[PDB]
Every structure is written in C-alpha cells, then in structure tokens.
Structure 1
Amino acid sequence: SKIRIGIVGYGNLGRGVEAAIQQNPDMELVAVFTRRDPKTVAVKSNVKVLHVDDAQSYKDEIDVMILCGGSATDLPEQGPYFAQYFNTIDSFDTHARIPDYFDAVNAAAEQSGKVAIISVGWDPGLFSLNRLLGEVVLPVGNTYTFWGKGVSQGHSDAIRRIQGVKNAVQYTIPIDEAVNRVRSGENPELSTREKHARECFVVLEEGADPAKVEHEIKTMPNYFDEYDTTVHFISEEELKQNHSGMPHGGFVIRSGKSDEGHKQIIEFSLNLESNPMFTSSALVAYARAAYRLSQNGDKGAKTVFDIPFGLLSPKSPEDLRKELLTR
C-alpha cells in the first residue's frame, strides 16, 4: 500500500510535489488543497482539487500533508493548523522566526500525535545539514554559504513592489573571486558585499523615472543596500523570453585544519535548473521519513537535523548497508 500524500497550496512548490510524486512510486497523490475556489485551480495531474476547509474531513485518507505555502504568512498559519490533523512537511525559511515557528508547530503536533518536519528543502534543508556536518567534522575552520547563480523570488518581488516597476527578475550571483579564495583554503574574512552581487532586470511602467527606480533598488534596506547591485531596463517580452526560469544553486564549504595543520576542505554544491522542483523533490523524500516516524509512534516537530538519512529511502536499512555504504 502506497503512502498517501496531500498537497496544501498550489504554487511553484505545489506543482513541484506533484511532479516529484511521479518519480516516487511508493506514493500517491490523493488531493490538492487550495484556498482559492477549486474550480479556478487547474492542476497538472487531474487529481481532485479541494478547498482547505475540506482537509479536516480527509484525516483518515492522507498519511502526509506537504505544505507548499509561502513562509512569510501562509505557513505561520497553515503549519500549526494542519499539524493538528496530519503528519506534515514544509519548507519554512524565515531565519528570525524559526524558533517561534518550531514551537507553534511542535505544540500542535505533540498534542495530535503527528510528526511535523519543518524547513525542508535546499536552504534551509540540505545546505543546513552541510553547515552542521562541516563544523562537527572540522571543528577548527570556517563555513561559507554561497547562493546562486539563480533567481530570487523575494528580491524580484521587492523590486516589483516599486512604483514605476511593472515586473522584474533578480539574480543572486556568488562572486567568483570570493568563492576561489574560500576553495583555496585561505579562510578569507568576507563581508556581505564581497560574497554576492545582485543583478536586476526590470521592466519600467509607462512614465517612470529610471533614475529614481534605480535609486530605490540600490538603496533598498535588507535587499540591496549591502550589495553591489546592477540594474538593466528591458522590455516585458525580453523578460519573458530570457528570464522565465527558476534556476538556482549554491555552495556550502567548510575549510578547516587538522590539529597538525593539514588543510581539509568539504564542499557541497547544487546546480539546479529548477529550484522549486528540487525543493519539492526533497519535501517528498522527507514525507517518507515523516511517515516512518509516525508509524513508529513518534510525534512532535522535527528539522532535517533530527532525521537519519536511512528513513528517506524506500529501500530497507539492510539493502542500504549492502548497496550504498561502500564502494
């Protein structure tokens, strides 16, 4: 019998999970749950689409609910809510609110007897695992995380909110020289501005002042003002034609030393044609883990830091020892 998945929320991650389900034959997609009217949400798989108010009624039909909503306001509501009734996975990524989100989800899950794995994906998620591994294997050393080259939806939206901007796509770009210094084992001290450049392609509204748009981008707090930021004005057709993907990636590197001075470097990197597709593929592996954990009577909120890799696999622990441990 297959592990029964539901999707909560049908954006990029929602479409991603749907696709990842096709690559995971031990799972089946029971339903997509949306806050929009189901009649207006066309899903690729033609499973049933339902409104979030019907989810509660599906409590015995679903093993794991993958929460695909945005971190800023969707998940703070939906994580604690769905964890009252289901085992859940989400991708929550707001640094400052992680202890608060964890607490709120854990209350709910503890209370219902369900497993909630929060903050799964590539960062947080895989990059987090590699930050941790780095510093426990090489306690004397330095960790560096680089993101990109890729599209940042958050920075793209920040530019779009500008009056006089009709649409935009921003790329986060690791600065090569900084990355090279890190990889060489120089253990550079690097500022914000020395690690990433920001590149912005922007479609002006009619009647906009480009100098003012450019200034508002470059002086924007929290998004652009600590970065060397470049702004290009282009047509809407060009933006569509050349800047429609959601590629991304990055590197986590630990450069350390043995106690006798040997230079040791660990590097974990990603090169993704689609960031949401990758993130969702990870969500689905983690759903397998949450299910195993629930079947064994576990409950409460977890992070990637709590989950042993063996639970992620449809293979038995014995076949894993045999096939992957060595050689």
Structure 2
Amino acid sequence: SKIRIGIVGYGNLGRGVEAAIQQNPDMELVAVFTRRDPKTVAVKSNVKVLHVDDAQSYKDEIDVMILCGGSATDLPEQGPYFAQYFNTIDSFATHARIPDYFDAVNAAAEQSGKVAIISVGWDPGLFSLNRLLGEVVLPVGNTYTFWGKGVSLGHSGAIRRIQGVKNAVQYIIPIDEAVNRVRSGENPELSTREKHAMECFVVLEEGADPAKVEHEIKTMPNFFDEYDTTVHFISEEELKQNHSGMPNGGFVIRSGKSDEGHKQIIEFSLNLESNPMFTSSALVAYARAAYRLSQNGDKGAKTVFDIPFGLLSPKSPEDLRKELL
C-alpha cells in the first residue's frame, strides 16, 4: 500500500509537506495535527484536521509523522513526544542543541522501537552531508559554508524593534568575491563577516528620521556592526510585492589537495525560490527512508549521516544501479 503520512503542525513546512505529497504518489497524507482548535484550521489538502491529543489514537493509521514545528520551542517537546508513538522526521535546526536533541529523541525512539530522523533539511541536512563528504574524500583541505541569499528572521526582528521602524525584511547574502577565492584553491581563513553581506528593506513609521534609524541599524552590536550592511527605505507595498517570498540556499565548498599537491575542489550549492517547499520535499524523501528502516526492524534516533541514499528513492536498488549509477 501507500506509505501513510501525518503532519504535525501547519505552518510553512506543514504546507510544504502537503505539496510534496502531491509529488510523491507512493505516499498518502492521513491528517494534519495542530495545537490550535481544529474546528478552526483549514488545510489546502482537505484531509482530516485533528488536535495533537488525538494523535496517539492514530498509531496504527500512520507510518511516519513529519514534525513541521519550529526548532526553538516546538520541536524540543514534540520530537520526543511523537517518537513515543510513530516513526518521525523533523527539521531541527539549532546546531548547538543537536546533541541534546538527538539524545532526547533517541531515548524516546529506542523505548518505542520507532525510527526518528532528526535535522532533515538543507542546513542541517544536505549541506551537512556535503561537509562530511568533503572532509572524507579530501582529508587535507578546508570547508566553507555560505548561507543565502535568504531572509534572516532574527535580524529582521531586531530591525523591527528599532523606534521609527514599521516593518522590515533583512537578508543574508554570500559575498561572490569570497566564493570565488575559495573556488580558486587559495584557502584563506574566512569568518562569517568575510563570507556574507547584509541587506535590509525597511518601512519607516510616519515622520520617522531615516538617518537615525539607519544609524541604529548599522551600529547594532552583534547583529550588524561588523558586517557590510546596506539599508533601503521602502514602502509596505514594496515589501509586499517583492519581499514576501522565502527564497534561500547558499554554498558548501571543500578545497583540498592530493598528497602530490593537486588542487581539488568540491562544490555543492542550492538556489531555492522556496525554503519551506524545498525543506519539506526533503522531509518526505526521508520519510520514505524512515519507513524502510522501520520495516527492517530498525529503531532509534538517526540523522542524515546514517541514511543510505538508496532508501530515499521509491525505485528498487536494481533499478537505481541501472538508471542512476
């Protein structure tokens, strides 16, 4: 039969998973599980909308639960909770807390005999796999990760907090010259300041002083003061017209040398019109591998490092060798 999927949480990732399901005909969406009153939440797919408290009664109805909650607060609770009852996938993205989150999920999943793949997505996720592949294939070398262009919600909210700002969108952008230095094999040391520029689109409150606001943004400790920062004062119409998308991506580059001195460059990049749609497409693919692992009697927390790529595909191992190898 089809692999049965549940969504927990109906935000951008949640919508992204519904859409990915449409691209993965071996998968069926069963229900969306929300913390909000379900009588009140509409979902584009028109499947059953249920409160998170009904989820346990769906244990025999759902093969993999895709957890589409936020990393700061939603996932720390929801990851361990849902891994008690289902195989799970999530996008947990706070790198520093990965080890603690893994341990928490793992406990749950080992107790339940379920597979929980944590931290799926471009970063962590696909960029991670490329960092790892780079260092093993080219052990003598340096890796550089660049992020964006994409919105930084934390920088956008810091701008919004400035008196005289009505609304704002801030973007992190890789610096092309630095990308190019890395591709050349020079192997400089590059900080985050050397790798990215910042660009801010800002709507003033009526009568606000643009010099003062731009001063407060460019001098803000931690957030902007040490980074090449451009500030554009624009209208709400412009922000709505041109800054409503959630584009994202960046680069992963390993520059290394053979033992004889040969420069070898590995470059992996992403250019995404939609961050959530891309992340969620990845989540569904991993869901297929968590289903497979579960059917083989596996259990416990996993990451992208533990998942053979063949299990991501609906194609037979034989057909993969024939078509893609």
TM-score bracket relative to the smaller structure: over 0.9
Q: Does 1:319 align with 2:319?
A: yes
Q: Decide which moves more: 40-49 or 132-141.
A: 40-49
Distance 1:115-1:47 versus aligned 2 partners, 3 A rule:
same
- How far, CA to CA, are the matches of 2:99 and 2:316 in structure 1? 33
- How far, CA to CA, are the matches of 1:57 and 1:160 in structure 2? 43
- How far, CA to CA, are the matches of 1:67 and 1:303 in structure 2? 15
How many positions carry a matched residue from both structures?
325
Q: Can you list the C-alpha shifts for 1:276-311, whole angstroms capped at 9, x where unaligned?
A: 100000000000011111111111101100110011
1:139 shift after superposition = 0.4
Distance 1:307-1:222 versus aligned 2 partners, 3 A rule:
farther
Distance 1:77-1:214 versus aligned 2 partners, 3 A rule:
farther
Q: Decide which moves more: 18-27 or 148-157.
A: 148-157
Q: Decide which moves more: 215-224 or 83-92.
A: 215-224
Q: Decide which moves more: 207-216 or 229-238.
A: 207-216
Q: What does residue 308 of structure 1 align with?
A: 308
1:207 shift after superposition = 5.2
Q: Decide which moves more: 207-216 or 249-258.
A: 207-216
Q: Decide which moves more: 7-16 or 152-161.
A: 152-161
Stretches of structure 1 that go unaligned for 5 or more consecutive residues are none
Distance 1:211-1:186 versus aligned 2 partners, 3 A rule:
same
- How far, CA to CA, are the matches of 1:210 and 1:312 in structure 2? 51
- How far, CA to CA, are the matches of 1:119 and 1:223 in structure 2? 25
- How far, CA to CA, are the matches of 1:213 and 1:57 in structure 2? 53
Secondary structure of the equivalent of 2:168?
Answer: strand
Conserved? CA contact 1:146–1:250, under 8 Å: yes
Q: What does residue 281 of structure 2 align with?
A: 281
Distance 1:71-1:215 versus aligned 2 partners, 3 A rule:
farther
TM-score, normalization by structure 2? 0.96
Q: Can you list the C-alpha shifts for 1:141-198, whole angstroms capped at 9, x where unaligned?
A: 1100111222233332333344443321111111111011011111112222111001
1:231 shift after superposition = 1.8
Identity of paired residues, percent? 98
1:36 shift after superposition = 1.1
TM-score, normalization by structure 1? 0.95
Conserved? CA contact 1:192–1:226, under 8 Å: no
Q: What does residue 150 of structure 1 align with?
A: 150
Conserved? CA contact 1:160–1:167, under 8 Å: yes
1:51 shift after superposition = 1.1
- How far, CA to CA, are the matches of 1:238 and 1:92 in structure 2? 32
Conserved? CA contact 1:87–1:115, under 8 Å: yes
Conserved? CA contact 1:34–1:52, under 8 Å: yes
